[PDB]
Short mmCIF file of C-alpha atoms in Angstrom, two decimals:
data_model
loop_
_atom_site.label_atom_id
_atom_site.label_comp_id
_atom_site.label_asym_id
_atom_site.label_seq_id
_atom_site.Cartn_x
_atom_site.Cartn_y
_atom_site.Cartn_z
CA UNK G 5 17.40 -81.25 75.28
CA UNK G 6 16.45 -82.17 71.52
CA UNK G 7 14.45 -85.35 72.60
CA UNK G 8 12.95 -83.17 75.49
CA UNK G 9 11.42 -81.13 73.05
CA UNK G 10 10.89 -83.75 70.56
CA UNK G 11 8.84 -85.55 73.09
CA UNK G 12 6.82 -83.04 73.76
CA UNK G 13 5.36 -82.78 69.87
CA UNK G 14 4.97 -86.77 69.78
CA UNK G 15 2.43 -86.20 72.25
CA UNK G 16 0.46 -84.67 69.97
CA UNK G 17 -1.18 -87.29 68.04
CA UNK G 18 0.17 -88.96 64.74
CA UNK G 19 -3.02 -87.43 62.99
CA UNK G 20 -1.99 -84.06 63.25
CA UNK G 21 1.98 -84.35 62.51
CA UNK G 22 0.34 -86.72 59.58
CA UNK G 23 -1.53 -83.84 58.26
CA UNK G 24 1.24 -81.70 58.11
CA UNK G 25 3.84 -84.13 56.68
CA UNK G 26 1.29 -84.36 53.71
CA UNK G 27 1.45 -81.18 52.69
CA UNK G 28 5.66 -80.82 53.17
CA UNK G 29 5.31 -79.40 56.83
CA UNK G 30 8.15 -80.06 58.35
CA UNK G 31 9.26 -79.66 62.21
CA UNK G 32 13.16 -77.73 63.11
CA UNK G 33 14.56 -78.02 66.36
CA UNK G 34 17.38 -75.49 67.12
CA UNK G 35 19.75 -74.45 69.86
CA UNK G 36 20.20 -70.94 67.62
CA UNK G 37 17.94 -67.94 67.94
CA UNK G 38 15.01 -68.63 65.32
CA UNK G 39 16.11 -65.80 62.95
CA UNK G 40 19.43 -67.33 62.59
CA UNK G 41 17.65 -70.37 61.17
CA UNK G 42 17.82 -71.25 57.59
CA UNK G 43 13.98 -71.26 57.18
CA UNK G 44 13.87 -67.40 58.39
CA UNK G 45 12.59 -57.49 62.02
CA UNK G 46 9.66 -59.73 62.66
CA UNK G 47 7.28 -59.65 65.37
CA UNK G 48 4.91 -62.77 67.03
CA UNK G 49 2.10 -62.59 69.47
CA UNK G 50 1.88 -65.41 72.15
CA UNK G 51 -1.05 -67.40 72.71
CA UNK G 52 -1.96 -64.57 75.74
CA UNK G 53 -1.62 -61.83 73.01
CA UNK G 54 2.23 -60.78 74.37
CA UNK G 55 4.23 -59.52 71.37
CA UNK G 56 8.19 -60.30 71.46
CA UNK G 57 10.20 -59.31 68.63
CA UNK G 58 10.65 -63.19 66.74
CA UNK G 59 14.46 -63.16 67.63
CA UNK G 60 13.21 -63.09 71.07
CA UNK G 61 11.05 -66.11 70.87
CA UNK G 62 11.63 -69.89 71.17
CA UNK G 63 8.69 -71.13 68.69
CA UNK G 64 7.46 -70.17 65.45
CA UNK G 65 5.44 -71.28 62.55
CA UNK G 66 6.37 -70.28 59.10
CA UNK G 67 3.41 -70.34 56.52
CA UNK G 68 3.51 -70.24 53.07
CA UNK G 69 4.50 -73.03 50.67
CA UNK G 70 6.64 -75.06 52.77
CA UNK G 71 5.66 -74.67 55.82
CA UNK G 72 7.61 -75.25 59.03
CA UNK G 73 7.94 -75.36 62.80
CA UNK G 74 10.47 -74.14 64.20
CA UNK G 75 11.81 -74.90 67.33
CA UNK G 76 14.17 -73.62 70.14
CA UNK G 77 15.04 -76.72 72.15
CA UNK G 78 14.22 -75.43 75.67
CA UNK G 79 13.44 -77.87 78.66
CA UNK G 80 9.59 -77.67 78.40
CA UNK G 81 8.65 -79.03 81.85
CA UNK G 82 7.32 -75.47 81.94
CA UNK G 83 3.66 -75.71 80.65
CA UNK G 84 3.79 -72.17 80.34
CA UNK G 85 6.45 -72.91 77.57
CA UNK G 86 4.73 -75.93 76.57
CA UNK G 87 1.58 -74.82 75.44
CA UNK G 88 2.69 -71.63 73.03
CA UNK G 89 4.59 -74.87 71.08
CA UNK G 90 1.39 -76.56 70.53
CA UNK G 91 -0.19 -72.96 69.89
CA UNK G 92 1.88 -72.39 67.44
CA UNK G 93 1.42 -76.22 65.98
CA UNK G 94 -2.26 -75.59 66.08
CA UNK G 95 -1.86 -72.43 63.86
CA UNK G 96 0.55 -74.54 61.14
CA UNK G 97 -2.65 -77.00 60.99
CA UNK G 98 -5.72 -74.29 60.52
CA UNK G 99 -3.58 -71.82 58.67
CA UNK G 100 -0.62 -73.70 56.58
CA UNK G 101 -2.07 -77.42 56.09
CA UNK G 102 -4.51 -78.58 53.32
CA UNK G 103 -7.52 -79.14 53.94
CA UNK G 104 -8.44 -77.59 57.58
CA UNK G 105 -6.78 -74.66 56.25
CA UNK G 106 -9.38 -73.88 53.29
CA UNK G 107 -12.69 -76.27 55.18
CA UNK G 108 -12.47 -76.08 58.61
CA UNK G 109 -13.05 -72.23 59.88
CA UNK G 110 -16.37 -71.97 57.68
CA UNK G 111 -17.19 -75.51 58.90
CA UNK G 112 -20.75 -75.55 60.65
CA UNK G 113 -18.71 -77.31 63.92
CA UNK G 114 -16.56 -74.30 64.19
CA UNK G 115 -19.48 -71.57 64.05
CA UNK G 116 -21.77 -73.54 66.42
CA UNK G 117 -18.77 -73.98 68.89
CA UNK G 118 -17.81 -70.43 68.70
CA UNK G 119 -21.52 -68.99 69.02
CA UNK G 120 -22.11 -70.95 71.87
CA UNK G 121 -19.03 -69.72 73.34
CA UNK G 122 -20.20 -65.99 72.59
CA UNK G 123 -23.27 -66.83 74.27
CA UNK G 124 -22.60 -68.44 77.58
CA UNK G 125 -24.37 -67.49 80.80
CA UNK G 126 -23.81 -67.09 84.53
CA UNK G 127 -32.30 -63.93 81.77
CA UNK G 128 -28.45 -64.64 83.34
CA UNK G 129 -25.82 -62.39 83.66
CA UNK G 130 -23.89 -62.87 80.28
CA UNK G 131 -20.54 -64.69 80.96
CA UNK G 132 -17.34 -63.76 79.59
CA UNK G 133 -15.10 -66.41 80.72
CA UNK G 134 -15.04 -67.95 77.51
CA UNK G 135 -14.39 -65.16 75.35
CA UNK G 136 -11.57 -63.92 78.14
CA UNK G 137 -10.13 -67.25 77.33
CA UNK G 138 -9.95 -67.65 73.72
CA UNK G 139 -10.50 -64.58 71.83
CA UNK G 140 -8.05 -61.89 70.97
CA UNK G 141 -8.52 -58.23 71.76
CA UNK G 142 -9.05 -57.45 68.40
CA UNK G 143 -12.09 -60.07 67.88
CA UNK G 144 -13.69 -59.28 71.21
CA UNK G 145 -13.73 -55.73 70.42
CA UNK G 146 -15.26 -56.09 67.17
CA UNK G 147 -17.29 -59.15 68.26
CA UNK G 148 -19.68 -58.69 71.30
CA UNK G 149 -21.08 -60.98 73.65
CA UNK G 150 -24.25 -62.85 72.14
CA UNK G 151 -23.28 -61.10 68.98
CA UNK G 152 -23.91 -64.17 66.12
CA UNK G 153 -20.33 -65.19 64.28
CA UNK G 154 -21.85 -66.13 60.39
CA UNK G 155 -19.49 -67.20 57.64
CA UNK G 156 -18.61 -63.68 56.37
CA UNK G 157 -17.58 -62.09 59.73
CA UNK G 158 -14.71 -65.15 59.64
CA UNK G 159 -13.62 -64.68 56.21
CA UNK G 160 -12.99 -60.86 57.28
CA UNK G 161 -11.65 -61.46 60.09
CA UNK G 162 -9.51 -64.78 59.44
CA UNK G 163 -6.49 -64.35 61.58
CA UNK G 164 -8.44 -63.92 64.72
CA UNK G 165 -10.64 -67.02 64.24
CA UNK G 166 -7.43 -69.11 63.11
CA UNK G 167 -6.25 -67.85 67.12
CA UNK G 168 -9.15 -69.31 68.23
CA UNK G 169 -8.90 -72.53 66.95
CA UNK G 170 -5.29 -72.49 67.65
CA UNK G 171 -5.47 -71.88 71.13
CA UNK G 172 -8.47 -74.31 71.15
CA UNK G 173 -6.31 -77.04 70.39
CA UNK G 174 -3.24 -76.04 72.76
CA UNK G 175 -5.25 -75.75 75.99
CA UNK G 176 -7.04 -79.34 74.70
CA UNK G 177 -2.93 -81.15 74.11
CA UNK G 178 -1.31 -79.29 76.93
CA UNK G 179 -2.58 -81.84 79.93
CA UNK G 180 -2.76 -78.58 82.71
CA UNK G 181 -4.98 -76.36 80.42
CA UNK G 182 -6.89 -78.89 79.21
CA UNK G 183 -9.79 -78.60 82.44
CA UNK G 184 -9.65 -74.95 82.47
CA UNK G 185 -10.91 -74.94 78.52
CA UNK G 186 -13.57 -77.77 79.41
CA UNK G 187 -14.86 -75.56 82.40
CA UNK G 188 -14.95 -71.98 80.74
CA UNK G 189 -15.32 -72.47 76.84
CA UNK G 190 -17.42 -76.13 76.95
CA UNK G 191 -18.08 -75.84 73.31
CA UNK G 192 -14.86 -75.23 72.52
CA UNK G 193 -13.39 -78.26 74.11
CA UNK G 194 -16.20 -80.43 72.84
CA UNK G 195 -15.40 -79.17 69.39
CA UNK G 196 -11.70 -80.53 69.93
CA UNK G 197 -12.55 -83.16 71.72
CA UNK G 198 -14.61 -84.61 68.44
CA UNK G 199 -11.37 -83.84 66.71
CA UNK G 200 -9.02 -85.44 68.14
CA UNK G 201 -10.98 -88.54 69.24
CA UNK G 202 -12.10 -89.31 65.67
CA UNK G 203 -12.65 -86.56 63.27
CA UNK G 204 -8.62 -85.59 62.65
CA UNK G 205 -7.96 -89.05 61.84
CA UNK G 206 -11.32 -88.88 59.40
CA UNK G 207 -9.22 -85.95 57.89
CA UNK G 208 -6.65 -87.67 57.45
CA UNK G 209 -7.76 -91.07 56.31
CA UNK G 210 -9.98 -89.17 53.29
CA UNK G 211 -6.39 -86.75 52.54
CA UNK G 212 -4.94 -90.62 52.18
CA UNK G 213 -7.63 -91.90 50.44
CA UNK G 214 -7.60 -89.10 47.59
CA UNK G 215 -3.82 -89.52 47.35
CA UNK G 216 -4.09 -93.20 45.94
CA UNK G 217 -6.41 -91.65 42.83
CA UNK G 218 -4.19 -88.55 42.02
CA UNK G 219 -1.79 -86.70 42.39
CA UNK G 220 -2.21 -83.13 43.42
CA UNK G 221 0.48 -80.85 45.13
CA UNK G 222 -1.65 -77.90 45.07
CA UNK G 223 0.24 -75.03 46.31
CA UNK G 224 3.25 -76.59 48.07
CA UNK G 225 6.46 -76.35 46.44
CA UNK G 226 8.52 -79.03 48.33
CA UNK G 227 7.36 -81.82 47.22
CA UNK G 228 6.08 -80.93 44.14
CA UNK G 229 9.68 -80.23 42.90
CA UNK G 230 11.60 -83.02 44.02
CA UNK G 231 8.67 -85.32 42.29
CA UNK G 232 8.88 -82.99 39.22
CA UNK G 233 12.94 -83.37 39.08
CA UNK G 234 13.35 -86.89 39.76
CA UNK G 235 10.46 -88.72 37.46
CA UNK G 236 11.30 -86.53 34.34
CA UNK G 237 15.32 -86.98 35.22
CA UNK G 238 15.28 -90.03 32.72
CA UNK G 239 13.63 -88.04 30.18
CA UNK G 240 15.43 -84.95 30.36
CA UNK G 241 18.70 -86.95 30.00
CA UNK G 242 17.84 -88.37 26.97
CA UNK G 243 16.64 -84.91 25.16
CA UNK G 244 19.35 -84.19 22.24
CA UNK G 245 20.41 -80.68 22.10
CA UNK G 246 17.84 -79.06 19.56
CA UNK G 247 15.20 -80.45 21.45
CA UNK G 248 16.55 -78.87 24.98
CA UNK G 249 16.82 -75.34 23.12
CA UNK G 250 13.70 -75.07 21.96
CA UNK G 251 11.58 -76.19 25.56
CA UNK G 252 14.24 -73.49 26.80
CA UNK G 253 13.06 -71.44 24.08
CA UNK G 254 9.38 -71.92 24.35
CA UNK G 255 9.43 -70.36 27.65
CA UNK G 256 10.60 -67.29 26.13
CA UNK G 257 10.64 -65.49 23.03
CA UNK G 258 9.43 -68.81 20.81
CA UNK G 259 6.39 -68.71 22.51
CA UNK G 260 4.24 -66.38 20.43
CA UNK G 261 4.99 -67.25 16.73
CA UNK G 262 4.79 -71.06 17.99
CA UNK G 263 1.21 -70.70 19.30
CA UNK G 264 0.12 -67.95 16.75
CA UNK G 265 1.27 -71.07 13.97
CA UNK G 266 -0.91 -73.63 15.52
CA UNK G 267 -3.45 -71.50 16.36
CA UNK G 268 -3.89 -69.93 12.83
CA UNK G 269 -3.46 -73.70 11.28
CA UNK G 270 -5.22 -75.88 13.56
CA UNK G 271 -2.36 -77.90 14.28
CA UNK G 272 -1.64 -73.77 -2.35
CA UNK G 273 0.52 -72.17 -5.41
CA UNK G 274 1.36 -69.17 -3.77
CA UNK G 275 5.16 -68.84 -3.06
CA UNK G 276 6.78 -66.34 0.24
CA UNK G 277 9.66 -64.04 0.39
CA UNK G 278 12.94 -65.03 1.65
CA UNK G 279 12.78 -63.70 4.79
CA UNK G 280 8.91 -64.73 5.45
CA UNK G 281 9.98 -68.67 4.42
CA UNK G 282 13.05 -69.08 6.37
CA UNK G 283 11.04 -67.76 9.62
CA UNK G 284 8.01 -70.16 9.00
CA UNK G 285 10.96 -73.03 8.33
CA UNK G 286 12.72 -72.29 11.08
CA UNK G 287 8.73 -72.37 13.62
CA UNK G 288 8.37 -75.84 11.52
CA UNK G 289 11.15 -77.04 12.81
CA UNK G 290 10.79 -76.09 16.29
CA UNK G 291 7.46 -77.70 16.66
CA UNK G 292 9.17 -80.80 15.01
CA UNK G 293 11.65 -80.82 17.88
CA UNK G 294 8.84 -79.91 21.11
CA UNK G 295 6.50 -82.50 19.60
CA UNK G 296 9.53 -85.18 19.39
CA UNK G 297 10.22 -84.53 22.67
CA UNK G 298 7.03 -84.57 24.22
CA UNK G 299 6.75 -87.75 22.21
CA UNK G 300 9.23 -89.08 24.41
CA UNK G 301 7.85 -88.24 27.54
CA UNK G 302 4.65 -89.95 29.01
CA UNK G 303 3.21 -88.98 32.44
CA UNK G 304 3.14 -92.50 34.81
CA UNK G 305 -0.02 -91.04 37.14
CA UNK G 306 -3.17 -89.55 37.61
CA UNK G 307 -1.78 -85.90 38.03
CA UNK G 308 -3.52 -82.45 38.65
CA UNK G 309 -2.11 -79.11 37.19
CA UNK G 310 -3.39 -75.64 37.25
CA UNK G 311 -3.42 -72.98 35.29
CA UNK G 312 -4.36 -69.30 36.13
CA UNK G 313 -6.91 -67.84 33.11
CA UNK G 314 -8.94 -64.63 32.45
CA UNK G 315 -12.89 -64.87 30.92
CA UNK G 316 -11.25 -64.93 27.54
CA UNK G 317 -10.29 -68.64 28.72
CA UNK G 318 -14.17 -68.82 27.29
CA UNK G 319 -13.77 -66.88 23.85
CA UNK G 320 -13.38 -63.71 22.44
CA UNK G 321 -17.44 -63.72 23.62
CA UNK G 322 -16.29 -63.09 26.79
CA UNK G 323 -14.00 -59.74 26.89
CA UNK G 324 -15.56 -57.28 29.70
CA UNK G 325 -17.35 -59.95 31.34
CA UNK G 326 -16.56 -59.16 34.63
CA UNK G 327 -16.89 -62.15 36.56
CA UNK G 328 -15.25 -60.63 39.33
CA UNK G 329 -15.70 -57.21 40.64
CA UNK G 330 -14.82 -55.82 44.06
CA UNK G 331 -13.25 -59.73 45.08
CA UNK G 332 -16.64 -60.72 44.92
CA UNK G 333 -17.14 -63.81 42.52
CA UNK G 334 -20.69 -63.18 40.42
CA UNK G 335 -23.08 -66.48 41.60
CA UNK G 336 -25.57 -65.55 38.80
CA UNK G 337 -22.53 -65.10 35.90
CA UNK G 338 -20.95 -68.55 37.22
CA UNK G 339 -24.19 -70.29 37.10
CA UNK G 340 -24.73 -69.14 33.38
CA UNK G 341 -20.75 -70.17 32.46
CA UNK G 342 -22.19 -73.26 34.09
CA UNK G 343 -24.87 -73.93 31.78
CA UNK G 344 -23.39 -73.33 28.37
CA UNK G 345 -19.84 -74.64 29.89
CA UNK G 346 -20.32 -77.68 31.54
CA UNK G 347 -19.75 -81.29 30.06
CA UNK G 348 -18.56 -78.95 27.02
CA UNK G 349 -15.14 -79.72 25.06
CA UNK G 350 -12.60 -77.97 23.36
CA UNK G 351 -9.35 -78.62 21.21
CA UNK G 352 -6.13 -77.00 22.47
CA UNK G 353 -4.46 -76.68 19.28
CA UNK G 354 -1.01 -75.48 21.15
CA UNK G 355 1.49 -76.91 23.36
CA UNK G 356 -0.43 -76.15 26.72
CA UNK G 357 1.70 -74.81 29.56
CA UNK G 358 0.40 -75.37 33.17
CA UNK G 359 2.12 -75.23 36.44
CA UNK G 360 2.32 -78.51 39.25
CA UNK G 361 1.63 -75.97 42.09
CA UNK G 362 -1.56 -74.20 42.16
CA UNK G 363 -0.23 -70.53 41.93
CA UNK G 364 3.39 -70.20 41.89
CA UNK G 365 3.98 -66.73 41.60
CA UNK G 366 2.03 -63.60 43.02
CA UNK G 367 1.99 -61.56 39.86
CA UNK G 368 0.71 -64.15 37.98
CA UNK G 369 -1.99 -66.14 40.23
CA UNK G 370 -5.39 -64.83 42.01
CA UNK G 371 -5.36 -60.79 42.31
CA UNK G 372 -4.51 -61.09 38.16
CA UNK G 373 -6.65 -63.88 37.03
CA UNK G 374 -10.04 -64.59 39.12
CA UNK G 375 -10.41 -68.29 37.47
CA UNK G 376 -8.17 -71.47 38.20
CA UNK G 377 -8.55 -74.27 35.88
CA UNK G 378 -7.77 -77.66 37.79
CA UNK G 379 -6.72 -80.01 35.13
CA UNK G 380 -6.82 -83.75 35.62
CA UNK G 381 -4.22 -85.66 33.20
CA UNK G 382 -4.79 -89.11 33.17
CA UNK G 383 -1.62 -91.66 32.61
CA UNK G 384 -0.78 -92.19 29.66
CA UNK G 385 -0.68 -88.18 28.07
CA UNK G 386 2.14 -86.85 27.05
CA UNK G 387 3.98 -83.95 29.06
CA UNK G 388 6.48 -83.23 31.12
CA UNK G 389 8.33 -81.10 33.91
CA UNK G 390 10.47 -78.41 32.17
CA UNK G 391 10.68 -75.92 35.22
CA UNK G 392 14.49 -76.84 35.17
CA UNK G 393 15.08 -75.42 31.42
CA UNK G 394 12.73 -72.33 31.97
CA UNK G 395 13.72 -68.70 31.10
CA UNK G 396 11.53 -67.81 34.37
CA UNK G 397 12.48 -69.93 37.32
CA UNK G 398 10.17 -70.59 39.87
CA UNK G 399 7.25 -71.58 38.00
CA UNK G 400 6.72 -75.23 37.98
CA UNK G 401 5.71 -75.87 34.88
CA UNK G 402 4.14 -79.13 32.76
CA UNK G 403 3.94 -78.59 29.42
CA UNK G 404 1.13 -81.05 27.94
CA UNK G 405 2.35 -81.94 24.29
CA UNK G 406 -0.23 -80.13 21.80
CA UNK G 407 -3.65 -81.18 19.98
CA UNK G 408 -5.10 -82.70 22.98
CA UNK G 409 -9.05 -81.92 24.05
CA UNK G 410 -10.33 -80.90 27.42
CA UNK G 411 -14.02 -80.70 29.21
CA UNK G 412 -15.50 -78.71 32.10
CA UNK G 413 -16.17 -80.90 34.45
CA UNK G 414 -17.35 -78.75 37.77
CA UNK G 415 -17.64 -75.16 38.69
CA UNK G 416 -17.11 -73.92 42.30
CA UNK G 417 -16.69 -70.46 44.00
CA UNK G 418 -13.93 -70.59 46.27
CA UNK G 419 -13.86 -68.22 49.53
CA UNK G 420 -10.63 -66.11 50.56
CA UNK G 421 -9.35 -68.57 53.08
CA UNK G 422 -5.48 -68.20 52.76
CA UNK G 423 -3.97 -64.78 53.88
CA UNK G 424 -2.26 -66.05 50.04
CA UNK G 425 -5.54 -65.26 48.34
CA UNK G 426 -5.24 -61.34 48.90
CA UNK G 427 -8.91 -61.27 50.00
CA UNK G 428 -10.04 -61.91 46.41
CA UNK G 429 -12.49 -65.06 45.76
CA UNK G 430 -12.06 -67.00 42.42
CA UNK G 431 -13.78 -69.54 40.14
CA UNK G 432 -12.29 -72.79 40.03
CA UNK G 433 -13.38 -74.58 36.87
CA UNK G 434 -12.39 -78.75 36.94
CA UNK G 435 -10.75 -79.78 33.54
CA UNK G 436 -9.87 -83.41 32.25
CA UNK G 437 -8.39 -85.00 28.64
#
C-alpha cells in the first residue's frame, strides 16, 4: 500500500518533512524498481553496511539540487524495512537539506555526543557497544576507541559521520530500535532526543523566520526556477524584439565589447573610420535596448544572488594573491581583505550578471573560483531573470541593470561540508546596493 508507506513517513515529525520541503525535497512513492523512476549501475549501503545494487533496493535518497526520496511502496510492518526508510530520510536531512547539512556535523552537540560514544565503559574495560552500533567499518577502523573526533577528522571523513547521524535518527523514529540506541549509544539518543523534542522545530522556526526578510534559494534549482519563470513572465512578455536579442545576445558574443564600453567610459573633434563608427553605433544601441529593458523590470523582494569571483574581484592589486592554496582558505590573507575591504564601496559600471542559485554549474563554481559573493538586492533595483533567453542554459541568471554600487558587508570562511564542494573551502564575501 501507498498510504501504508505514506503513514509510515508522517510519523516522522512535521519538523523534519518541513525542513526538507524548504529546500524543494520532495518524497516519491513507487510500485516500479527505483531506477525505473524518473528522478534516477548504482550501488547503496544499508543502514547495517549491506551493499545491494540500487535496482535491488526499495529506498533511496537522491542528493544534489533537488533532492528526493524515493520510495518503493512495500508493506512496512517489517521494522527491519521500516527503519532503512527513515535511514535514508535521516541522510536527505544531514546531507541534502539547508542548514543541518552545512551546521550541524561541526556543531559542538554532535562532537560531544559522538566522543562520548567513543569513550564509553564497561579503569573499565572500554565498551564497544556503541561504536558496534553506529559507526561504519570504515570510521571504526580509522577511528579508535577513546580516540577524540575534532572538527577536521569530520570534514575528512564526512560521509561516515553523516551515517552516524543518520542512523542516529532512524533507531530514535523507528519505535523497536529506539531502546536499544538509548541503552548502548546514551549520548547519541540524548543528542536526538534534544532534537526532536525542541531543537528541529528551533531549526525550523529560524529557516521560517529568515524566509520573511529574503529571499535566498541558495543552491536548489526547483524552486528557484519556477519563482524565476513566473514573476518575470509579465516582463518578459512585454520585451519588444530588439530588446529580447540583445539579453539573448549579452549572454554571448555581445558580452565583451558591451562591458569593455562601459568599463572604458564609466557608464571631442576627433572623427572614426567607417568601420570603427558603425561598431561603436551599433554597442550604443545595444546598451540603449538592455538599459530600456531593465528599465522595465523592477525586482518585488528582498532577494539574494551569487556570483562566483577570483582575487581580481579586488583589483588588478590582487593577481597572484593566492588566497587559496591546497583547499585551504588563508585566515591571515582574509583577515587583511577584511580590513581594507569591509564597509568599502564600489561602482559596477556594467550590466552585472549573477546567478539565483549559489553555484549552478561545476566548471564554473568552487574548484574554479575560491570566493562567493552573496549579494543582497533590496526591492526596488532593477533586474531580472533572463535564464530563459540565455545562450548557456542552466545557469540561472539575474542580470542587475548597470551603474549600481555595492559594499562588503561580512567575510566568512566556509568549511567543505557538501560532497558538492570538491573538498575545497572558499571565502564568502556578503554584498548589498
Amino acid at each position: 500500500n501507498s498510504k501504508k508507506t505514506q503513514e509510515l513517513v508522517e510519523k516522522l515529525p512535521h519538523e523534519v518533512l518541513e525542513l526538507y520541503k524548504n529546500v524543494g525535497g520532495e518524497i516519491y512513492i513507487t510500485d516500479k524498481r527505483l531506477t525505473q523512476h524518473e528522478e534516477l549501475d548504482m550501488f547503496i549501503v544499508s543502514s547495517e553496511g549491506k551493499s545491494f545494487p540500487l535496482r535491488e533496493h526499495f529506498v533511496f535518497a537522491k542528493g544534489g539540487k533537488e533532492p528526493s526520496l524515493i520510495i518503493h511502496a512495500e508493506d512496512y510492518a517489517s521494522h527491519l524495512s521500516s527503519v532503512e526508510v527513515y535511514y535514508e530520510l535521516g541522510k536527505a536531512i544531514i546531507r541534502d537539506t539547508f542548514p543541518l547539512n552545512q551546521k550541524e556535523l561541526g556543531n559542538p552537540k554532535f562532537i560531544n555526543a559522538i566522543n562520548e560514544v567513543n569513550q564509553q565503559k564497561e579503569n573499565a574495560k572500554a565498551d564497544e557497544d556503541g561504536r558496534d552500533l553506529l559507526f561504519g567499518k570504515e570510521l571504526k577502523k580509522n577511528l579508535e576507541h577513546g580516540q577524540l573526533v575534532d572538527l577536521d577528522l569530520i570534514s575528512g571523513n564526512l560521509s561516515e559521520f553523516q551515517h552516524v547521524f543518520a542512523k542516529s535518527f532512524a533507531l530514535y523514529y523507528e519505535p523497536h530500535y529506539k531502546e536499544a540506541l538509548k541503552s548502548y549509544a546514551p549520548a547519541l539518543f540524548n543528542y536526538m532526543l534534544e532534537l526532536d523534542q525542541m531543537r528541529f522545530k528551533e531549526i525550523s522556526d529560524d529557516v521560517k523566520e529568515k524566509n520573511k526578510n529574503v529571499l535566498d534559494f541558495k543552491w536548489y534549482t526547483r524552486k528557484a526556477e519556477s519563482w524565476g519563470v513566473q514573476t518575470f513572465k509579465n516582463w518578459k512578455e512585454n520585451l519588444t524584439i530588439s530588446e529580447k536579442d540583445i539579453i539573448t545576445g549579452y549572454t554571448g558574443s555581445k558580452y565583451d565589447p558591451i562591458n569593455e564600453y562601459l568599463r572604458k567610459y564609466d557608464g571631442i573633434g576627433g572623427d572614426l573610420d567607417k568601420k570603427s563608427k558603425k561598431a561603436l553605433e551599433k554597442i550604443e544601441n545595444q546598451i540603449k535596448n538592455l538599459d530600456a529593458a531593465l528599465q522595465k523590470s523592477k525586482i518585488t523582494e528582498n532577494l539574494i544572488v551569487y556570483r562566483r569571483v577570483s582575487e581580481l574581484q579586488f583589483g588588478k592589486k590582487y593577481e597572484d594573491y593566492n588566497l587559496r592554496q591546497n583547499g585551504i582558505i588563508n585566515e591571515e590573507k582574509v583577515m587583511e581583505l577584511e580590513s581594507n575591504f569591509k564597509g568599502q564601496t564600489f561602482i559596477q559600471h556594467n550590466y552585472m550578471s549573477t546567478s539565483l542559485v549559489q553555484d549552478p554549474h561545476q566548471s564554473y563554481s568552487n574548484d574554479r573560483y575560491p570566493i562567493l559573493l552573496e549579494i543582497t538586492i533590496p526591492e526596488g533595483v532593477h533586474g531580472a531573470y533572463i535564464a530563459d533567453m540565455s545562450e548557456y542554459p542552466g545557469q540561472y541568471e539575474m542580470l542587475i541593470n548597470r551603474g549600481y554600487t555595492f559594499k562588503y558587508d561580512k567575510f566568512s570562511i566556509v568549511k567543505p561540508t557538501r560532497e558538492e564542494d570538491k573538498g575545497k573551502e572558499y571565502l564568502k564575501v556578503n554584498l548589498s546596493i
